[PDB]
């Protein structure tokens, strides 16, 4: 069952076509992707331990053809190892094509392809910001609940060669030990507060010493000193997150102690931002590849 090669083939078939060309997989093929990837997610740790080399990417948000460009410029799997930091759906016009290809690669190369959970991989959020609408339109309500059951098993964070800490949002006032993350059981919803919430929602802030209230109305903001203390305590060099759109696709914080990655250029078509992608080699040297709109 589950013809992975056929699915992937039909998903890659629309390269170079007029931007907007859909890929209508069958309800069963998509449901198969959710269930199989769900196993692999639960089989792997909730706190991924990864090795170089690999490519890190930020938010995609249903911008499917921009995702294909990333793979085109960065190298289609398994020519390159990948780590995505979440927010694959919502706001884009092709969330379905986006998440399906990602899951398809997750199943095809489970040791060379990894997906983190963003704050939009939550039922409470993607019901409103477009993903549920897309499911209702092109399929049915029950397919959406299937995606929900799959998103609840996504890993939350990742550490690359004991030096680079990766998560969608940022840090948490309740994050004292790395075991506090490993102790979280899946499947799980995203609470409106706590460790799991902050890891997917928090933002860095220049004008903040310590922790401050977050503009989003959820979680907190954190300052440069918090990043410094955090990195020193766990013997880490870099924090690699996403969650926020930045002009050049990448943006440094606290003297290059933290980096924000965003991989969706022309976000919502309302921004003029670029998308970036960070490559990390075996010597832990990080380089950026930019996608101009």
């Amino acid at each position: 069952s589950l013809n992975l090669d056929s699915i992937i083939g039909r998903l890659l078939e629309v390269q170079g076509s007029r931007p907007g060309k859909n890929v209508q997989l069958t309800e069963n093929e998509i449901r198969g992707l959710c269930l199989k990837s769900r196993e692999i997610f639960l089989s792997q740790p909730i706190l991924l331990e990864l090795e170089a080399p690999l490519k890190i990417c930020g938010d995609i948000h249903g911008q499917y053809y921009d995702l294909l460009r990333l793979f085109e410029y960065g190298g289609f799997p398994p020519e390159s190892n990948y780590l995505f930091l979440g927010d694959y759906v919502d706001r884009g016009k092709q969330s379905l094509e986006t998440i399906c290809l990602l899951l398809a690669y997750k199943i095809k190369y489970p040791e060379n392809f990894f997906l983190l959970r963003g704050n939009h991989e939550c039922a409470s959020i993607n019901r409103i910001y477009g993903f549920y609408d897309e499911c209702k339109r092109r399929y049915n309500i029950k397919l959406w609940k299937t995606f929900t059951d799959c998103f609840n098993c996504l890993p939350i964070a990742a550490i690359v060669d004991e030096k680079i800490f990766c998560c969608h949002g940022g840090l948490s006032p309740d994050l004292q030990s790395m075991e506090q993350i490993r102790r979280i059981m899946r499947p799980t919803d995203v609470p409106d507060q706590g460790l799991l919430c902050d890891l997917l929602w928090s933002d860095p802030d220049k004008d903040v010493q310590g922790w401050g209230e977050n503009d989003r109305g959820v979680s907190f903001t954190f300052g440069a000193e918090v990043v410094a203390k955090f990195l020193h305590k766990h013997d880490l060099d870099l924090i690699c997150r996403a969650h926020q759109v930045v002009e050049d696709g990448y943006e440094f914080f606290a003297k290059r102690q933290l980096v924000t990655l965003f991989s969706a250029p022309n976000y919502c078509g309302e921004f003029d931002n670029a998308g970036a992608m960070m490559s990390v080699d075996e010597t832990l040297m990080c380089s950026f590849q930019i996608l101009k709109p």
Partner: peptide, 22 residues
């Protein structure tokens, strides 16, 4: 080749970035 660890080096940043137009 797998890169998932079972359950000395330092981080540097390349001064050159590649820019793709599309």
């Amino acid at each position: 080749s797998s890169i998932l660890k079972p359950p000395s080096r330092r981080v540097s940043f390349a001064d050159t970035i590649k820019v793709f137009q599309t």
